[PDB]
Design a binder for this molecule. Sequence first.
Ligand code: HEC
Length: 71
Amino acid sequence: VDAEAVVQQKCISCHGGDLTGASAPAIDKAGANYSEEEILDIILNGQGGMPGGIAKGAEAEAVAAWLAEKK
Ligand code: HEC
């Protein structure tokens, strides 16, 4: 995946360039809060205001897993 590139044009759109939370809660430390399995699910199936399947395909995987490393 280019996980970061995706995030840098998908998640940051609400989570902020910095992932520190802007229009949405900070996922900077999502990988610590929740496992790739959970984060991936959230990306795929959104959550509250977050529309599910913002990323799809290996995109979402790479993002989630890259985030699993980002703590
Ligand atoms: C704005 C339309 C969003 C985009 C684009 C992405 N996310 Fe998001 N996310 C958003 C909100 C409003 C919320 C909270 C939803 C609620 O009201 O309950 C979230 C939540 C997450 C979470 C879980 C955090 C938590 O609720 O405890 C994760 C792990 C997450 N989001 C990841 C994520 C990624 C990686 C995205 C890019 C593919 C992404 N989000 C986009 C709003 C928005």
